[PDB]
């Protein structure tokens, strides 16, 4: 039979209709008054969290991060620039807001490591994402056969090197064939052309 | 070119800032749970460095010592009141509603409880005209008819120090001394006296503006100079 979770998921396929709508109109009021990074005891989207690796256990942390909506907050040029490089307004950044969110979170928890993240809505001027972080040092995790991998030294600052799931999608690594000539094995190895 | 003076202003450097650290008080109306029970006694009449007008030192019953926007007439010893029931005499402060129409008022609030905004310069005063359960039309010293919430507090009488503008500065030194106590860069060099690089009116072998002086409101900072969005110029016609 359907799982309880399946309902949470099904409700978020349309965050603008039903109870979820009424729910958001409410929460956001409180959210807009919270900080940049707010640790929260329980995932707002249980299906998604668990689906993404979450796990109600010690060493697993979650926090909601809000990032401003829109293009790049860029300063106009103060020296010679050909018409091509004289832009400011239409320029956008190459990292999506969700990736910005994962980083602001990870920086808030220096000892933790980003496991994953997911969207929980947005108002007119900002987006919220909930980031799942892990304490690579807690034995409750060093002994977890489904998460102890994140404890390896080479997983240090994994979000800052784009090893996150949102990281790898944003690096154009989704496709294994056509179109990913300049992306895999890495953007930088491909002379930054992706 | 280079940024014009109006652009250096905004940066808020020392030169353009006001000597706040030398200012006495941020004159603002007192608060009262309600009732109006509040009242105090004038203790002294001081000079206010930020407005070149006098301010009155007042002591209230709850032992609160604060400076007030001294209207004309208030002297040491006098007793002033603040509240919905305060008397209707000069110096007292009460909502526009409780004020009789046709009475000169000063330091009027724009939003009830904001502590006063309008008419607080030397000698000026507002004029309460129309009452209502909603609007309290007041004629500001500029002539405009400001419709206001009757709950907006105000002080009765005209601001002290009237007539200041009558005597000429006579000499640069006097101006100098005044300017030194304000957020203003002085003296003023005429745009037309500068180099093109420095101002849109600069340049030429003789002094005259480059183009016409009346500039569109849509003009960008760096170019908005001269007669800003003038509806007209000159004295004639």
């Amino acid at each position: 039979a359907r799982s309880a979770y399946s309902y949470i998921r099904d409700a978020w396929e349309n965050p603008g209709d039903g109870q979820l709508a009424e729910l958001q109109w409410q929460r956001q009021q409180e959210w807009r008054n919270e900080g940049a990074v707010e640790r929260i005891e329980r995932p707002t989207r249980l299906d998604k969290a668990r689906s993404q690796g979450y796990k109600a256990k010690q060493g697993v942390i979650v926090a909601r991060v809000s990032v401003r909506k829109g293009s790049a907050r860029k300063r106009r040029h103060k020296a010679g620039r050909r018409s091509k490089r004289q832009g400011v307004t239409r320029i956008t950044r190459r990292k999506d807001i969700q990736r910005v969110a994962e980083e602001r979170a990870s920086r808030t928890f220096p000892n933790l490591r980003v496991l994953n993240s997911y969207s929980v809505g947005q108002d007119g001027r900002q987006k919220w994402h909930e980031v799942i972080l892990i304490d690579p040092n807690h034995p409750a995790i060093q002994n977890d056969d489904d998460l102890s991998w994140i404890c390896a030294d080479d997983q240090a600052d994994r979000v800052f090197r784009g090893l996150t799931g949102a990281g790898r999608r944003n690096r154009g690594l989704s496709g294994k064939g056509k179109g990913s000539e300049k992306t895999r094995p890495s953007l930088r190895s491909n002379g930054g052309k992706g | 070119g280079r940024r014009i003076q109006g652009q250096r202003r905004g940066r808020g450097t020392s030169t353009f800032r006001a000597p706040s650290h030398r200012y006495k008080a941020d004159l603002e109306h007192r608060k009262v749970e309600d009732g109006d029970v509040i009242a105090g006694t004038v203790v002294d009449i001081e000079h206010d460095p930020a407005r070149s007008a006098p301010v009155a030192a007042v002591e209230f019953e709850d032992g609160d010592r604060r400076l007030i926007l001294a209207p004309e007439g208030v002297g040491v010893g006098d007793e002033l009141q603040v509240g919905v029931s305060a008397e209707i005499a000069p110096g007292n402060t009460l909502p526009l509603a409780e004020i009789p129409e046709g009475v000169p008022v000063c330091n009027v609030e724009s939003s009830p409880g904001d502590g006063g905004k309008f008419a607080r310069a030397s000698g000026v005063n507002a004029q309460l005209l129309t009452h209502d359960r909603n609007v309290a039309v007041v004629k500001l010293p500029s002539g405009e008819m400001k419709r206001l919430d009757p709950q907006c507090r105000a002080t009765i009488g005209v601001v002290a120090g009237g007539g200041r503008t009558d005597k000429p500065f006579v000499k640069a030194g006097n101006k100098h001394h005044k300017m030194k106590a304000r957020g203003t860069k002085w003296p003023n060099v005429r745009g037309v006296a500068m180099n093109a690089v420095d101002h849109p009116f600069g340049g030429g072998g003789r002094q005259h503006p480059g183009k016409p002086k009346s500039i569109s409101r849509n003009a960008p900072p760096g170019r908005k100079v001269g007669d800003i969005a003038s509806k007209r110029t000159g004295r004639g016609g």
Binding site: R82, S83, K84, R85, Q86, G87, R90, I91 | -
Partner: protein, 92 residues
């Protein structure tokens, strides 16, 4: 100059002289879907757009003759070299 709306002349299709009818080539309308139309959208961005930033050049003192010769028999037209003419008017 003056010119007969219709007259006998060689029809490259029939391979024999027929009575043709002369008409001034009316400009067909654009689809806005040609390759060039796409490249304009594609290639245009921030700042100067290169070739897509240019604007049409002037005119020559006199234009050449832009005509279609229609065969009255098989109804098929054919094109010919034109010739500079300040004005061209058909007779009937």
């Amino acid at each position: 100059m003056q010119m007969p709306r219709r007259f006998n002349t060689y029809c490259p299709h029939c391979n024999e002289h027929q009575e043709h009818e002369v008409e001034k080539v009316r400009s067909g309308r654009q689809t806005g879907m040609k390759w060039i139309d796409r490249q304009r959208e594609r290639n245009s961005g921030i700042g100067n757009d290169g070739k897509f930033s240019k604007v049409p050049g002037g005119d020559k003192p006199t234009k050449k003759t832009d005509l279609k010769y229609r065969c009255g028999e098989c109804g098929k037209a054919h094109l010919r070299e034109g010739w500079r003419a300040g004005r061209l008017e058909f007779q009937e």
